[PDB]
Amino acid sequence: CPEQDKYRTITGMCNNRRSPTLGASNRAFVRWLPAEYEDGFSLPYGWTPGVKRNGFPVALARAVSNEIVRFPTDQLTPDQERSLMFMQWGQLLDHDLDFTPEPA
Amino acid sequence: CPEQDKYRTITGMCNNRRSPTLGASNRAFVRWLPAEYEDGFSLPYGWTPGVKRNGFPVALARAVSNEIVRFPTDQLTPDQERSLMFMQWGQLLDHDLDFTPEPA
Amino acid sequence: VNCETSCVQQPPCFPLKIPPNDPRIKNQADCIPFFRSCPACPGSNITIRNQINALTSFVDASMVYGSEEPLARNLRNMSNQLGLLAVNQRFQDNGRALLPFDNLHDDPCLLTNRSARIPCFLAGDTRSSEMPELTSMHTLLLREHNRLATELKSLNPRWDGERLYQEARKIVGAMVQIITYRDYLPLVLGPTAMRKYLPTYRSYNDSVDPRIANVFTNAFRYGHTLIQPFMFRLDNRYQPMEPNPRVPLSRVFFASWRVVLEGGIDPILRGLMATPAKLNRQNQIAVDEIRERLFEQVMRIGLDLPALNMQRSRDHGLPGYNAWRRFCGLPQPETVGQLGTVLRNLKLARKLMEQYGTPNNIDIWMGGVSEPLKRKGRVGPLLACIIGTQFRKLRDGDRFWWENEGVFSMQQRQALAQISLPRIICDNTGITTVSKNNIFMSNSYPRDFVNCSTLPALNLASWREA
Amino acid sequence: VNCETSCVQQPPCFPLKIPPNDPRIKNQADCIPFFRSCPACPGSNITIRNQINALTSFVDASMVYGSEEPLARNLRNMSNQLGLLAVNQRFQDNGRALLPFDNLHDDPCLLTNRSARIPCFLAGDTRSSEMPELTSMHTLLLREHNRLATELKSLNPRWDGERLYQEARKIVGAMVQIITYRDYLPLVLGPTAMRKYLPTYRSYNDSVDPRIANVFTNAFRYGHTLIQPFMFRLDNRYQPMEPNPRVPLSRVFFASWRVVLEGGIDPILRGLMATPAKLNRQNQIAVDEIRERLFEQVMRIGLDLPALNMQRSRDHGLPGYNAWRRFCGLPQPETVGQLGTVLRNLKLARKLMEQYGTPNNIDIWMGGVSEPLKRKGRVGPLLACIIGTQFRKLRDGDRFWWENEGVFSMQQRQALAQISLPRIICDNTGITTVSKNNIFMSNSYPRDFVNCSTLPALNLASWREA
């Protein structure tokens, strides 16, 4: 890309002159901490039955959701300081920031 | 990994309980700073003639080796405090620590 | 291999198993659909697995103009020579504007209301048709950009369309940047977090890393903790609609016909303006509506959001809760008493301990949400520590920041430092009554409502070239 | 495609270039062979090219036993219960052991002497027979392991071969670890550098990353500046030995026959303990011998070492010198005068600035080496920091560290603190003259050599099982 430029680019290249490809979409994330897998590189926890994590059995997600998350619906308590604009703008910002693809 | 062990593994696997792969062989390096390339991901510097690095041309390795490293051999000076054991110990240590494969 | 109609555990599928005695489903042979993320390196047994991203990490209004050249070319209007976006033709919302349509192979939009026969919309992202409110926001942004471009063209006659288009894009990006920061940021974390994590801007830096973190994503899923189970509307004089004043959820998902054939977008904005939100508590977390009848119509069985979040967290491979507590520099509990004292509830500590066994295995989302709230805030210390560092890193790595020298001028900055979130609805819709100071804080009626005339505007005389 | 017989610039081939008026290569159309490193992801257009490792990062004497299952299975002795190591069967050097031979499709050892028909050697690494002193060191280590295993078997009769093998390996690994640390480290970094970078050991820590980085690989190569251009020898009573007492380094590369048919390994060591090294100065940076006639007899054109190193550094994709100066929290010069002040020299900085355009483009190796050294040390204020950080990261992560609790008893720790290399040399062969405290410091005769009669011995009474 040329020495002199004025306006942005659609893809996002040459935003960092030292490394032009930093963050210009279609790139993998950055790991603040090393990952963890059951097999070591490719298998997540809870795949093969009978395999314990850190010496303890794994817990089903649905059971945990049914235990603590559950609450009656007729005991709602409104918050007297914020509106729905809060949640809407949060959702819009999240849609702006990032996205993750999945196979079809 | 087995819950109990007494001796080192042949390849260094399962040395870290939480992440077994960390430290084993046939794995990738680690990066402390982002990498820089000609186009961003693969091309190195100097592959394409007539390109500049940070607005200045890049000199040749052979020329810079000829200009600076050259020195007449009759004016050698012997160190009076250190013996020749340094070569062998450094060789052992670096041949133990790492080795980068190269295509044949 | 079609996971939409099968339950065999074969890659790349990963269904969810159902525990016994589920209140909703009794049979144990059922399954919940689920998909796995796309690996970065296919068929490699050397490197560690990684995921992909498909959007620009910078906050530069990338949700309207797209993130790829073909999409930007398709969205632009090239018929005449002014510099403009694309609008629909078959419908109009009281003669103001509308979004263009889209073509899909197997859309979910046509199924929800067969008699409607209304297709989906087209925007800069593929998840814009979830609720009508997102469509309303996108249409508002498009209308604002349209008006700005028209005014800028009306100012200078010598200029060509491309210059006006690019300048309008720059103006819109700067506006959204300053609005989101200066308004949203202080109202979520607190004053202490601002003092500790976000100092005053000093100068540009080029050695910082502007990439988005892998973990950060899940943290923002905290936004799923506050959702009302109803949807409201009201007319120009603030009383509820007749009929259908309060429409329940689980019936408006992927409902494109509601915006088109049921009035438009103004009543939705009016309802959005004057409705309070939900308050988080340690015994009330997730609303039942979005947890038992989610996407009920489009699929055979409804799903639940917390279970999907936990499954995604497990699939990604993030470490436990104690490691993240150690990362920010906070004490690490070991026994039941320490955790109970930290959370200030022994009953909840016991409840978590029967299921998760040890504190090390608690997932990031469940641990983060369960933390006690801060004063004048909405998240615990851990989520604050996670979010603040990421936002600070994102702020100090953008070469086109509006405060950087060489991008704007002194008079231009002085003029631009006035824009507020209101005065946009007034100048783009028929609404005459808005809030007073902050759109995100005032909700009581009519204690915090004024007229449209008492709102200042912006002048573009500086941008004139001669 | 063969690069050693071609100059085409197509992957994986990265030839060098020569400037006009080259003292050696008068023809400018010639090429120097070079190959690119093997990538990690073969063909991906998304990720960034990275290299791979081949040996364990922990210091566990991996240079003798290996790191792959078939290699370690083909190096042991499975024909006896004793569980010793494999030795040669056709040649003996009047001693007790020698390295086994090897068979390869292409053997560079055969081309050194046509009438010797001596092939190359085999060890835990592929480059064992490339520098003869390395071969002598490996032979000595193997002899030490064999003696230790024999004694350990003799102590207790009822054990099994596997137990003796593992015990001997563990003893050797801990012993080499302690000697290497306690002897090598104090004589490179200096007193203040280690007092600031290496505190005292406290306990195990599993939250640290024990991996390795490219920068350490390219920065540990300072030793190439100490090269001595000759090989010397002596006899039983210190004096030059006839015939051929001094040999040039050029005609010794890949020449293992000189270790078998002549000498007997001992004179090489005897020359080793009693010869000083080469000092480094700003105008005596590197010896001419390695830059003019490197691997002359094995290829068509001799290669240059520093040019090869800089080409490798450029290919690996490492940042500039200024970035690494900033990474360590040191002032970064920008102008020629600032470079002169920071380099404690004028002409060298002038030459560096003339050969480049800015200090920001200075390569890592030249910048690190050219800097003035510290007091009572042999490295600059940057290489020392890099090496110390890498060593500290490598130390506090290994679980089987000898000082860690649960791996050795109080008696074994008390009796294992007095192991020294001079006893190793005096015990494993017929060497009778050693230095007192540091073989790396005492380098004179006869004022710094005594017989090993006045020297302690290592005891294994505490290892007895009953």
Ligand code: HEM
């Ligand atoms: C007898 C002494 C030494 C050499 C002969 C020699 C030469 C090389 C060569 C040709 C390479 C490149 C290919 C290879 O791996 O052999 C090389 C790389 C490395 N060196 Fe060398 N060097 C001699 C001396 C030393 C000393 C004293 C070292 C350290 C104190 C030292 C280190 C290294 C390292 C770590 C490498 C990297 C290997 C790689 O493949 O990148 N060497 N040396």
Ligand code: HEM
């Ligand atoms: C941030 C954020 C994400 C991450 C987007 C991504 O990773 O692609 C997110 C995701 C989801 C998901 C998970 C499946 C997927 O998107 O691939 C669903 C089913 C979903 C639906 C709903 N969204 Fe959401 N969510 C994020 C954050 C937020 C916020 C933040 C303030 C709000 C508000 C919100 C709203 C809702 C929602 C409300 C009822 C549903 C259903 N989401 N999103």
Ligand SMILES: [Ca+2]
């Ligand atoms: Ca090793």
Ligand SMILES: [Cl-]
């Ligand atoms: Cl690095």
